Design a protein around this ligand. Sequence first.
Ligand SMILES: Nc1ncnc2c1ncn2[C@@H]1O[C@H](COP(=O)(O)OP(=O)(O)OP(=O)(O)O)[C@@H](O)[C@H]1O
Ligand SMILES: [Mg+2]
Ligand SMILES: [Mg+2]
Lengths: 581, 590
Amino acid sequence: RVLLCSAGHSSMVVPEAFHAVPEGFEEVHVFTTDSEKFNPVVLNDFFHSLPNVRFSITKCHGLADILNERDFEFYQEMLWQWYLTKMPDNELPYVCLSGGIKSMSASLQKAATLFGAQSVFHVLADNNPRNIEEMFDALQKGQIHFIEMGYEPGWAALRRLKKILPINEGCSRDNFKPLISKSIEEILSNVKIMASDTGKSNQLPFPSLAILPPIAQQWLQLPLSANDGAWIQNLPKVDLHCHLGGFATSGSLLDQVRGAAWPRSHKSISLDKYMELGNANGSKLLKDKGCLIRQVELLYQSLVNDNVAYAEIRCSPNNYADKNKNRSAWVVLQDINDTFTRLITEAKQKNQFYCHVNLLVIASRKFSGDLSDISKHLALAITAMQQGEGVCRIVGVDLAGFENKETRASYYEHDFKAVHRCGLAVTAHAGENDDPEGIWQAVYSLHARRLGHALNLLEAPDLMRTVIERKIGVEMCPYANYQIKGFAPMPNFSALYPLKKYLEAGILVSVNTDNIGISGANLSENLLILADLCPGISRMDVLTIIRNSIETAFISHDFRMELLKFFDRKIYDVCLISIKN
Amino acid sequence: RVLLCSAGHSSMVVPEAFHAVPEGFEEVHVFTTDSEKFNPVVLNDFFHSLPNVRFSITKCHGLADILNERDFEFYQEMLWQWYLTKMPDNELPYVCLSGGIKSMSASLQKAATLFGAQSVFHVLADNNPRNIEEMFDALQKGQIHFIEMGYEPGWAALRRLKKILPINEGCSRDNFKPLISKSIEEILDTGKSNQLPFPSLAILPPIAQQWLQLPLSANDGAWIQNLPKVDLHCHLGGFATSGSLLDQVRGAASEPDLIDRTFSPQEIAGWPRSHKSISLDKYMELGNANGSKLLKDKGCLIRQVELLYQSLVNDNVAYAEIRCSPNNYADKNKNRSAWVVLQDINDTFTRLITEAKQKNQFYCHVNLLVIASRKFSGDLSDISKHLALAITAMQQGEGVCRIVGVDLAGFENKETRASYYEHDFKAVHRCGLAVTAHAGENDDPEGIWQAVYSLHARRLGHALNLLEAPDLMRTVIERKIGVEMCPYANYQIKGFAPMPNFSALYPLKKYLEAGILVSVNTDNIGISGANLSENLLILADLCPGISRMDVLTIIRNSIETAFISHDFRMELLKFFDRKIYDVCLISIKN
Ligand SMILES: Nc1ncnc2c1ncn2[C@@H]1O[C@H](COP(=O)(O)OP(=O)(O)OP(=O)(O)O)[C@@H](O)[C@H]1O
Ligand SMILES: [Mg+2]
Ligand SMILES: [Mg+2]
């Protein structure tokens, strides 16, 4: 509980307001001007009599009183800044208004209305006391009276202005700026625009960050530029398709993993050049335990570094098992889950920003070899998702592997009759070289909630309508197809990336890293390449991509609500901060 | 314009504010406490020099000054009543706060921020003039400052308390209910925090923005009617069943000779609020006066369709999907094939839509759902006939009132679990139609799994027993499968609280908390005797504790689960957003 009150010429308010609540308060802050008429001795000694509670005094520098428009506006700005910087982090505070002359009272009431307060109140005394003993006497005789105005909820979008400026290290008139005036003007302009127009008044198709200033919305509508790298890095992101085993394939990551026991190339290649390039890690190296643990920690640190708020990781437990060391695939997967949940809990305990990660069990399409491997992987995933306890868990399986006409979705469909029965989820990888019939059956036979790549949807309008109406997601990684196919004005390759057309059509497109290491680029860089690779892309479509990514994730309903709330708050804060610079 | 002021020790701050606008002011109305320090004669002399400016004087009778809680609250209620009485009809009043001690200034400022004011401001003078020949040179020298903090729109529609609460200038604190106190006391869960659809709801003033979270009550009938709604499970054949609608459709027949005017469905006490549970057979027999025995006539069908569309527009519906059975209305004697009947319905609805849109009025875009019934008395080839007819109507293509998809429904006695009729549904999805399924009205929760994973049904009719199959509820939520539910019909044919001798609770609240994309519909309008508005409003005494934001998110869910194209969905969402914003701003101005 926090009490905020204004100080004018006399010290009536602070003690009577402090004791006005029977329980008392814990922190009390008082605002005052540069006038020398006020004395800080009485309040200081009274609060030193009870050191258990907190107390502070804030003085408006260079302003003894209000004498003109500039004086009043500067005083109001300083009061608003003090209220904002003394705002309790979660709960609303209490406000006493009886301090100062009527102009301070009105400004403080306006501040309470705008930023919200728990229960504002008035304090009046008939005898006009002077000193502590007889404040206590008048309180004992019952002459004390508290007048309660009400409970102001305030603008929830206004309380998030502490990020732009907590304090400007004691700003002076030479470098003064009216930021809270910017806040009030943005809210009044938004309301007036709502009440005046109808077109812009109804358009509003997005997660209720619409309380942004109109200038911010206009900046958002502008096409995305290559210089928005800082903003996009500051933007919280989601990576729904990342491979654990392809991280330490280049740079010092591989050396660190071994000891702990490009990317804009214009070469068009067709497979096996990521497999052999990444052969330095994965099956050959991660057989032990220390290498796997170091790889997991490095991947989590990289994910947190890029401000990613949620990710789904596809791993190959059978590729890492070592029977000679009594290291079964189930043991490897349990180790992965345990280290990920330990890292998540460790980050959460520090209250620092953390990246929730869920695991997807891959089902490698080895084709002829060991046909029982598909059944083994499916059963492993089914029984592994049932461990229950743990922030990190298994939410689905994967169907990646060697894609072929014989390896179509109608080849393994005998084994998937129970994956949906037990409540799992299925993704798929098709369309890069397969037939639209294969994609259609994968959508309708395997009931694949998501889908990998399939850049040639445009050639099948019927299948495009089928995927759009069923809200089947698409995981398409710009760097992957840039290195594989011809995009981003690739020489001798006039093909253009269908991400723009996918967005206009309405396909829930998610941008992913695929494999960070071999591609040598993170998800932020993946978003930047869309600027020059796809001309005429606006900054709003990036947020649409983020929303689609968090909508197509295999997550629970309540977890989705939590992620949506956090993403809304973070997007609001980062946009409000970044519009200034 | 009208300006309002309140002051204490100072006597003529009102003339000081009278020069705030260089063009001038038109009306002055001052309200103050009964203290003698205010001088009314000086203001009277000042305003007598300007006859064109109305000057009305009112005082807080019986209260010299605020001294305790009771005096403060009495002054506050009197001031609120005077404010909502004296505000201009179409313009926000002017108000100034240059005078008065903390209590009245705070009360009037809080009142202004609730209703609204054209401009609240402060006027302070450097030399604090005592007499008028002093403030003349005070304003001439520029010492007087027009301190203005900003425009105060307030709640652009809150003044209905002027009329819903009768204007009573002469009254005391003994009789007043602070509705604002109830609407303010409890404001600040994840659900209501971030579950808001329609982004513009965030723009609303905090009073309304929190009002939407209060529990729904039966007194919100006007508000709930004024919202644009969506109906997805509506049966054309059950629209007109008795009364004036039946008389009109009977009178519009081409041949009135063969119209059975003798039959009349029996009455049920308290209908639609049934005094006891009813069976499905009696529920259908209640609609025996209409259906297919009377709809064979072309004129009857045209009248029924036009009347149904008029009712839909009257109920403020903005989008609807109509379930119809074209084969049931076919007659080979008059060359009335099922395709001809369906085509005629399509042209009639398209003509109505175009004629309503050309006049820039309110129209509800309507699409048809064909019904592939369970085909009582065998003869299951009719399923294939219905599917072929639906596909042909689908790639007919051109038009406005298109065909969205098919529907499977019928009796549960045959024990059909989407496996008997699965043999023919495969070809539907190739064309691009959509499939619903009336699954699990009173049956086991097994067949729903087949309807979802083999029929690929994108919606589920009723499904009131989903709460007992958590494994099924998980995949229902995870696949984004809509669940159409009809409150009045299910209550009548199954029985729910608060109907005595019953203990089952309607699962709508738990369905919404879990996250099922539930959309509330009306089923058969005529038989149940309740339109969409009454069906939505019955949730107050059907599911206690339901909130208005839950109703808005129900409308959003109905928008989500409807079979429409992406662009049309975007336009519908924009229109719904704007309209719903205007409704929550203006209708609850009460
Ligand atoms: N689902 C989540 N994903 C990521 N972070 C979360 C999640 N839920 C809660 N948090 C964390 O809750 C914390 C709340 O922080 P707060 O609202 O006080 O803003 P802040 O500390 O000023 O800045 P920041 O959000 O960067 O921490 C955030 O740091 C956020 O990382
Ligand atoms: Mg991949
Ligand atoms: Mg029905």
